[PDB]
Amino acid sequence: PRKALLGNWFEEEAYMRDRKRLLDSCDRGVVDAARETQRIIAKVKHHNSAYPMAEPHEDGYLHFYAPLMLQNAATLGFLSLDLEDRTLRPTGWHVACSTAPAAGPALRNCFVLVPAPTGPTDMIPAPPDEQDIVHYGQPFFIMTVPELCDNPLSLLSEPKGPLSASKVTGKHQDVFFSPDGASAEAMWVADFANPDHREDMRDLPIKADAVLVIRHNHTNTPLASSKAVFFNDFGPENEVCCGRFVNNPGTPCGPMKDENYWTFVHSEN
Template sequence: MAQNLYGPGVRMGNWNEDVYLEEELMKDFLEKREKGKLLIQRNRKLKGNLLRQMQLSISEDECIHYGDKVMLVNPDHVDPEAAVFLAGDLSLCMTPDEIKAHLHEELEVPCGLSAAPTKNPVGRNTFVVLSMDRNANGQVLRYGEDFCLGIMAGSEDKMLYLASDHRSLLKSAKKSWLQEVSLVDEMSYLACWQAAYLDPQLRLEYEGMPIPANAKILINHSHTNRGLAAHRHLLLSTYFGKEAEVAAHTHLDSHRAEKPKNHWMLVTGNPRKDSPTMLELRNPQGEATRPLEQAGNLCAE
């Protein structure tokens, strides 16, 4: 195609067509900017919603209740099976697909999940503990009860729910090919989870006991009986950088006990102003050996 060497100013060639084309491009640009539909405006809005500061619930009786806002944290541990892994406490985070986040104004469903070394509660890592019957707000969450975990999808009027389903050829985790975990917009049996006590020898004794806040627990999918796991050695390229993969799989050691990959903490807010969470005040030595008679008195009905 021959190059047009004449500009609109010399009034030769297709000068009138070029003038109209420039006017249409400028008009389209101004219209999109006014409506907030430019790519840079959509990116700023999405990041602003996902990274906005959140306030976690403060547990006065040291227990988790329905309706509490918490962070799901995989505590720091050394993984001898992997030479390269993410160290430190990893929090469960909403991870929108990078391409879809650029092309669409809203989050696409299902939305991905990852584990990132984030200690501050923001929009993408703050979950709400929900009851299936929606009438249990304020009541204590107990071991063995079905519950849901919801998160605001970048806005205050739309909530997504942590869900999983059996692995198939078309649906599995990206790196490990294990059972996928994602965020969906429907609360169903696929979004039901249960908490289990960390020590398998005391698990039956703790059934029905209140779940303490900021203590290590297991979170299992009710439908598939797979444990929520953070794979620190499998890194994903996400919208926010390199983060660890999250899947639903129970990793057992030689003693038939769950590995640290399956250990989680429901972290609440700190009533003091020196830290937004209770992570710095935890007691790892005592939380796994708490006597059974003390667990029954953790929370008052």
């Protein structure tokens, strides 16, 4: 509008039009609120693009080099990453990760499995015809799809100490994504669901739908997802950490509750 022209209307009209021209034309980096809100919207739109997941194999086993999802037994959410919650650390770049519900496969929750070259010095090697099948006790890597970004990322963890803690609760180990890979801190080993038959099923092929526990090979601490909730650009998401969850704190070594169990999700037939 124009209003009545009493007082300082001329200079303020000029000031307002110059401010409008500055805001519309200049970029100003992160200072501008509208531009950063728009870029966060574009961020969310990009991260949730659909992905053509692979169908289950005929033999019914777990295979390498195939897109997959990770779902937790307690939260019933899928593992996801946020590329922009990143801070530089003395050991490298750390990218935060969480677990969230989703409507299907996406660029933020589809992973592949890549085997590691060294076993635990008492391994019985698999036959040449089972090279692509994943066996219990065999280390492997978890990696992001090549379409997400230029440099592939990997799931890593670090030992707990004064300078290392979990994201929310701060009482367990930290799990994060990093361009670091092919290192001793990126190896994971799966085990059997039933505790008494755990060492009878060692070095055997894994069925496509088995419930299983993932352990950090270099620290021997299982992967888990608690019920702690934090907010980000996508909404409310849960926490991901390495630790053993038990019913009685007085006996830390014992039965493990449902939030140490995971599963692999394929595409519907």
